[PDB]
Curated annotation (Swiss-Prot), chain A:
The gene is S. This is Spike protein S1. Changing residue 21 to I: In strain: Omicron/XBB.1.5, Omicron/EG.5.1. It comes from the Viruses. Binds to host ACE2. RBD also interacts with the N-linked glycan on 'Asn-90' of ACE2. Cleavage of S generates a polybasic C-terminal sequence on S1 that binds to host Neuropilin-1 (NRP1) and Neuropilin-2 (NRP2) receptors. Interacts with host integrin alpha-5/beta-1 (ITGA5:ITGB1) and with ACE2 in complex with integrin alpha-5/beta-1 (ITGA5:ITGB1). May interact via cytoplasmic c-terminus with M protein. May interact (via N-terminus) with host bilirubin and biliverdin, thereby preventing antibody binding to the SARS-CoV-2 spike NTD via an allosteric mechanism. The chain holds residues 348 to 396 of 1273 of the full protein. Attaches the virion to the cell membrane by interacting with host receptor, initiating the infection. The major receptor is host ACE2. When S2/S2' has been cleaved, binding to the receptor triggers direct fusion at the cell membrane. When S2/S2' has not been cleaved, binding to the receptor results in internalization of the virus by endocytosis using host TFRC and GRM2 and leading to fusion of the virion membrane with the host endosomal membrane. Alternatively, may use NRP1/NRP2 and integrin as entry receptors.
């Protein structure tokens, strides 16, 4: 989508595996705050957008 | 003085893949490897 017309997306019930994600070509960076890249495999969430 | 090349991992030092974190006391001297240790890529 474009910046002005960005598409809304919600992730439903999922058993998430992040260790296969960080070495995919579009998911190299994790430059942010409030979550930890080595801790997302042990956390639980209400929903993910 | 250590001698390693990472991908870019540049936000950190992935790299549980061989434990040298930010709160380790030290200085980081770093530059791009694409000018000397490289090819077309």
């Amino acid at each position: 989508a474009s910046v002005y017309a960005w598409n809304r997306k919600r992730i439903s019930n999922c058993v998430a595996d992040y260790s296969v994600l960080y070495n995919l070509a579009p998911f190299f960076t994790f430059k942010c705050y409030g979550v930890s890249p080595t801790k997302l495999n042990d956390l639980c969430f209400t929903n993910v957008y | 003085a250590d001698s390693f090349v990472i991908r870019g991992e540049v936000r950190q030092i992935n790299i549980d893949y061989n434990k040298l974190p930010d709160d380790f006391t030290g200085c980081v001297i770093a530059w791009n490897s694409n000018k000397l240790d490289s090819k077309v890529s």
